[PDB]
Design an enzyme around this catalytic site. Structure first.
Site, mmCIF file in Angstrom:
data_model
loop_
_atom_site.group_PDB
_atom_site.id
_atom_site.type_symbol
_atom_site.label_atom_id
_atom_site.label_comp_id
_atom_site.label_asym_id
_atom_site.label_seq_id
_atom_site.Cartn_x
_atom_site.Cartn_y
_atom_site.Cartn_z
ATOM 1 N N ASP A 133 18.950 -30.616 52.521
ATOM 2 C CA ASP A 133 19.507 -31.267 53.917
ATOM 3 C C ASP A 133 19.895 -32.719 53.752
ATOM 4 O OD1 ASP A 133 18.400 -29.249 55.471
ATOM 5 O OD2 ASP A 133 16.342 -29.882 54.994
ATOM 6 N N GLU B 3 22.907 -30.670 55.809
ATOM 7 C CA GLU B 3 22.489 -29.820 56.920
ATOM 8 C C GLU B 3 23.641 -29.979 58.014
ATOM 9 O OE1 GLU B 3 21.959 -26.928 58.126
ATOM 10 O OE2 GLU B 3 19.779 -27.328 57.434
ATOM 11 N N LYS C 4 8.080 -23.692 51.368
ATOM 12 C CA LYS C 4 9.359 -24.304 50.853
ATOM 13 C C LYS C 4 9.460 -24.505 49.334
ATOM 14 C CE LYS C 4 11.806 -25.705 54.783
ATOM 15 N NZ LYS C 4 13.018 -24.903 55.024
HETATM 16 O O1 LIG Z 1 23.956 -25.956 59.091
HETATM 17 C C1 LIG Z 1 25.417 -25.247 59.151
HETATM 18 N N1 LIG Z 1 26.136 -25.721 59.885
HETATM 19 C C2 LIG Z 1 27.449 -25.098 60.193
HETATM 20 C C3 LIG Z 1 27.317 -23.906 59.365
HETATM 21 BR BR1 LIG Z 1 28.862 -22.678 59.756
HETATM 22 C C4 LIG Z 1 26.418 -23.127 58.662
HETATM 23 C C5 LIG Z 1 25.185 -24.265 58.430
HETATM 24 O O2 LIG Z 1 24.325 -23.738 57.545
HETATM 25 O O1 LIG Z 2 21.025 -24.038 57.030
HETATM 26 C C1 LIG Z 2 21.001 -23.076 57.873
HETATM 27 N N1 LIG Z 2 20.410 -21.778 57.555
HETATM 28 C C2 LIG Z 2 20.092 -20.782 58.394
HETATM 29 C C3 LIG Z 2 20.145 -21.065 59.834
HETATM 30 BR BR1 LIG Z 2 19.837 -19.899 61.335
HETATM 31 C C4 LIG Z 2 20.980 -22.237 60.116
HETATM 32 C C5 LIG Z 2 21.078 -23.153 59.112
HETATM 33 O O2 LIG Z 2 21.952 -24.331 59.423
HETATM 34 O O1 LIG Z 3 17.009 -26.536 56.007
HETATM 35 C C1 LIG Z 3 16.788 -25.821 57.139
HETATM 36 N N1 LIG Z 3 17.764 -25.398 57.902
HETATM 37 C C2 LIG Z 3 17.491 -24.197 58.949
HETATM 38 C C3 LIG Z 3 16.156 -24.274 59.273
HETATM 39 BR BR1 LIG Z 3 16.033 -23.215 61.063
HETATM 40 C C4 LIG Z 3 15.074 -24.988 58.540
HETATM 41 C C5 LIG Z 3 15.542 -25.527 57.574
HETATM 42 O O2 LIG Z 3 14.600 -26.131 56.793
HETATM 43 MN MN LIG Z 4 15.421 -27.943 55.993
HETATM 44 MN MN LIG Z 5 18.965 -27.117 55.437
HETATM 45 MN MN LIG Z 6 22.786 -25.113 57.643
#
Ligand SMILES: O=c1[nH]cc(Br)cc1O
Ligand SMILES: O=c1[nH]cc(Br)cc1O
Ligand SMILES: O=c1[nH]cc(Br)cc1O
Ligand SMILES: [Mn+2]
Ligand SMILES: [Mn+2]
Ligand SMILES: [Mn+2]
Ligand SMILES: [Mn+2]
Length: 200
Positions: A113, A85, A139
Site C-alpha cells: 500500500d 494503492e 495478511k
Molecule cells: O488500486 C488500484 N487502482 C487502480 C487500478 Br486500475 C488497480 C488498482 O489495484
Molecule cells: O489492489 C486492489 N486489489 C483488489 C481490489 Br478489488 C482493488 C484493489 O485496489
Molecule cells: O491492499 C488492499 N487492497 C484492496 C483491499 Br479491498 C484491501 C487491501 O488490504
Molecule cells: Mn491493504
Molecule cells: Mn493494496
Molecule cells: Mn489496488
C-alpha cells in the site's frame, strides 16, 4: 429506520476522487461496484485510510520526519510516504521498482500500500470488520515478504502492527480510527452496517 443503499452511502460519504479510484480498481479486477456494494464501500474505506496514513507527514530539510497540518508545506519538504494503492497495475509496479532499485529495498511479491521513506520499508495497510489478530495473520501468511510492515485497523478502534511497531504517532492513528467510527455510525444509521460487517 429505512434501509438505505450502499451506493448512496459511498457517493455521499467519500470524496469523488476516492470513489473514482475504487471504481477503477474494481473494474480492473472484474468486480462490479453496483453488485458487490459492501466490497465497493470496503475498497473506498481502505483507500481513504491509506491516504490518511500519509497525510501531513513530511521529511524536512534535515532529513527528520515532521508533521505539517496546515495547508501549505514549505517547498523544501518531502512527502514521507509514497502511496502505491490507488495506482493502476503498470504505474504501481513502476513506482515499486523505482523505490527498490533505488533504496536497495527488496521487491515485494505483491503490491503493498505505501512506502515509508523514514523507516525505509513498504507497508501493507489492512482494514477489517473482524478481530485484528485474525486478519493480521491472514495478511502475514499471504505476503511473508517479511520486510513488508503490516498495520491493521478495525472499525472498533483496535490496531495490530508488525513487531508492535505502529509507525505513526497516536494523534495520526486517532484520526483514522475516528474516521472509521464515523463510517460505521453512518452506515448503522442507514441500516447498512450489520450486513457490511458480516460480509467480510
Ligand atoms: O488500486 C488500484 N487502482 C487502480 C487500478 Br486500475 C488497480 C488498482 O489495484
Ligand atoms: O489492489 C486492489 N486489489 C483488489 C481490489 Br478489488 C482493488 C484493489 O485496489
Ligand atoms: O491492499 C488492499 N487492497 C484492496 C483491499 Br479491498 C484491501 C487491501 O488490504
Ligand atoms: Mn491493504
Ligand atoms: Mn493494496
Ligand atoms: Mn489496488
Ligand atoms: Mn505535496
Amino acid at each position: 429506520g429505512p434501509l438505505g443503499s450502499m451506493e448512496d452511502f459511498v457517493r455521499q460519504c467519500f470524496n469523488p476522487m476516492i470513489v473514482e479510484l475504487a471504481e477503477k480498481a474494481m473494474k480492473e479486477y472484474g468486480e462490479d461496484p453496483k453488485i458487490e456494494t459492501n466490497k465497493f464501500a470496503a475498497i473506498c474505506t481502505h483507500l481513504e485510510v491509506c491516504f490518511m496514513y500519509s497525510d501531513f507527514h513530511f521529511i524536512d530539510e534535515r532529513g527528520e520526519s515532521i508533521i505539517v497540518e496546515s495547508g501549505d508545506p514549505n517547498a523544501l519538504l518531502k512527502h514521507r510516504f509514497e502511496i502505491i494503492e490507488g495506482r493502476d497495475r503498470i504505474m504501481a509496479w513502476t513506482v515499486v521498482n523505482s523505490i527498490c532499485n533505488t533504496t536497495g529495498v527488496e521487491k515485494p511479491k505483491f503490491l503493498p500500500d505505501l512506502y515509508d521513506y523514514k523507516e525505509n520499508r513498504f507497508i501493507e495497510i489492512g482494514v477489517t470488520r473482524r478481530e485484528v489478530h485474525i486478519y493480521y495473520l491472514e495478511k502475514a501468511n499471504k505476503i511473508k515478504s517479511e520486510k513488508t510492515h503490516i498495520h491493521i485497523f478495525s472499525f472498533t478502534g483496535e490496531e495490530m502492527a508488525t513487531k508492535a511497531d505502529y509507525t505513526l504517532d497516536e494523534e495520526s492513528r486517532a484520526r483514522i480510527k475516528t474516521r472509521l467510527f464515523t463510517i460505521r455510525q453512518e452506515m448503522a444509521s442507514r441500516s447498512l452496517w450489520d450486513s457490511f460487517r458480516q460480509s467480510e
